[PDB]
């Protein structure tokens with residue numbers, strides 16, 4: 019019968035820092051992680067900036083021998099996983115290793131490695147493709163490499179649901195624990211799509227902000243002058259643990275994961291419906307799953323991508339789900355500061371939602387200078403808002419009309 | 431407690447045929463779908479053959495214009511899914527559409543599309559990249575496009591667990607239904623990795639058979655002269671349905687899905703442990719999940735990739751799990767005929783396991799001319815074996831040491 023699930027460890031790489039506490043201090047100070055991209059020549063691209071991870075040292079985590087074989091998205095997922103496991107204080111043993119699994123996902127996976135090997139294939143031929151090309155590029159290898167290095171023999175898998183990946187990964191990992199398939203899961207996501215194909219591909223769809231001359235102002239969710247999402251890199255991982263397992267070992271518990279929802283829009287490959295009907299179905303599934311009155315929701319970490327249609331669909335969904343309470347809760351997009359970490363978005367945003375509970379503060383939506391038509395909720399414009407938060411909701415919506423919602427609450 | 435899950439529809443593209451019945455006729459006849467790859471200069475490659483889908487007409491399913499937006503692996507997953515839904519006779523309505531979801535995965539996803547866009551990017555720069563490059567290439571678009579086409583509003587996600595994808599997709603969809611999150615799921619996998627990067631990538635790892643002179647003899651699971659796996663394309667989809675939901679509408683039920691196991695080896699990035707400890711744990715987990723004794727298993731659809739280490743690991747795992755029953759069950763690798771469909775392997779092999787139950791016949795392991803040291807089980811060498819089959823297992827073992835087992839039983 020269904021067990022309770024708590025958060026005992028968290029780990030992160032983001033455009034604002036190389037761990038959770040540095041990232042969160044940036045979030046609460048309203049600091050932007052967005053800057054011109056330095057790692058390649060973007061002069062022929064319509065977008066030349068994004069949220070890069072700055073000064074990542076893989077030799078904090080892995081031998082340069084192992085690290086050379088792995089795409090950056092895998093390096094980033096392993097860094098966040100290692101941080102989360104250490105933060106949890108969990109000791110892996112012969113007695114518990116079969117009950118500890120991993121579900122670390124990615125939206126796009128090893129696009130840089132595939133680009134570089136494509137360059138070798140076309141310029142020099144197939145014999146120059148890396149022997150490590152496949153295991154170094156495919157999305158399940160965060161889960162694989164983490165399991166090999168820590169000795170995790172529990173459920174081992176990976177989700178890929180585009181921009182919903184991190185939220186779905188955490189939710190489904192919680193279901194694993196809830197239903198008795200594992201006692202512990204490391205779950206979240208990682209992304210590093212800042213290569214020619216990534217910036218070029220999103221560029222070809224005209225989905226990216228082209229505010230090259232003021233990158234820190236590009237990501238402006240619900241602002242009338244928004245002109246698309248900002249592409250960002252990084253990773254979030256959480257250690258999810260059955261409640262009595264966490265209590266038995268004296269774990270520090272950050273918060274409880276009480277609700278998880280999923281829905282499909284069944285509308286369009288890339289565009290969200292204007293009314294947010296799919297997002298609303300998803301949130302309602304999540305709140306019913308958590309046994310909550312919608313009026314209990316104090317904080318929403320929005321998907322809030324800074325796209326014309328996505329930002330307004332989310333207002334419509336929140337008004338539909340919460341009615342008059344939509345005017346009492348606080349809703350913010352941390353993507354205003356971090357940009358859009360795609361498959362990692364839901365994982366870092368789940369961590370920001372847990373810290374909003376820990377610290378009783380709503381992170382700001384920076385750059386919200388002129389809220390658009392109908393964007394009249396408390397969107398925590400400009401500056402962090404200390405307030406009561408018992409229940410926090412984290413939303414993600416992706417290509418293919420795939421929606422996820424996570425519901426967290428304080429644990430006492 | 432938990433709801434029962436039955437299979438009411440199946441769909442497939444394979445190297446043996448463009449649907450399930452034609453594929454299955456090939457399987458029972460011991461026919462190979464392996465041939466030198468056409469319309470692609472493979473002179474510089476150490477492997478020049480594979481399992482191609484022959485004569486696929488996407489316009490049976492999509493307009494030319496919508497098909498042009500989608501990588502071949504998505505077209506193949508949509509064909510299998512459309513076939514499965516049609517095979518099920520399910521009528522989607524406003525009363526049930528929220529209860530019908532999709533979990534179609536891929537191991538490698540849109541390599542062909544990525545490859546063809548690298549050409550544009552390197553030669554002509556980013557402005558030639560297709561606007562549909564991202565949504566047309568990402569693994570969750572089979573689930574996405576199927577939900578949009580059929581109006582499915584249930585759980586919408588995609589697994590990517592390398593060669594375990596199709597098995598995990600079906601098992602995790604079955605759980606969704608068992609635990610009441612959906613009444614119907616369309617689940618399985620698709621793969622089209624026969625590009626330079628696929629053939630070159632596996633080739634650079636020396637993972638592939640190089641038996642260019644006799645492609646139909648290359649895939650020879652447990653044969654002493656095997657020299658690695660054969661790369662194959664295609665897709666499988668199953669309609670999973672809650673038992674009372676299937677009975678109420680008068681559905682034709684192929685078989686019941688009674689068990690699902692997962693385990694991580696935590697051993698090596700690409701090689702299974704010699705003793706198959708991980709595959710043994712996973713099968714034991716699946717039998718416990720089904721409430722069945724090892725002695726009740728009659729037929730195993732092996733992973734049986736024709737790699738030296740993989741094939742022997744599976745014999746060790748089966749002897750360990752099944753003890754004095756190991757010789758009474760029949761175990762075969764249909765990869766002897768189909769080659770290795772990677773993330774689709776588990777999907778098409780779940781279909782073969784279901785049809786083994788329907789037709790009371792163990793498919794052959796073709797090319798098993800000289801069983802290797804210790805390969806003394808009933809591996810159904812050369813020809814199909816009619817026999818009693820009440821319980822059938824389908825095993826998948828993939829990169830990252832990720833394992834899955836499905837347990838099917840006759841329904842009456």
Ligand SMILES: NC(=O)c1ccc(NC(=O)[C@@H]2CCCO2)cc1
Pocket residue numbers: 036037078079100101103104
């Ligand atoms: N051996 C491990 O499992 C491992 C765990 C954690 C780390 N690093 C951190 O936790 C970071 C380093 C600075 C801030 O936090 C490195 C290795």
Ligand SMILES: NC(=O)c1ccc(NC(=O)[C@@H]2CCCO2)cc1
Pocket residue numbers: 305306307308309310311312
């Ligand atoms: N609005 C409410 O006060 C409320 C209370 C309880 C529930 N449901 C449950 O607690 C269980 C948990 C999974 C579904 O049923 C729903 C709503």
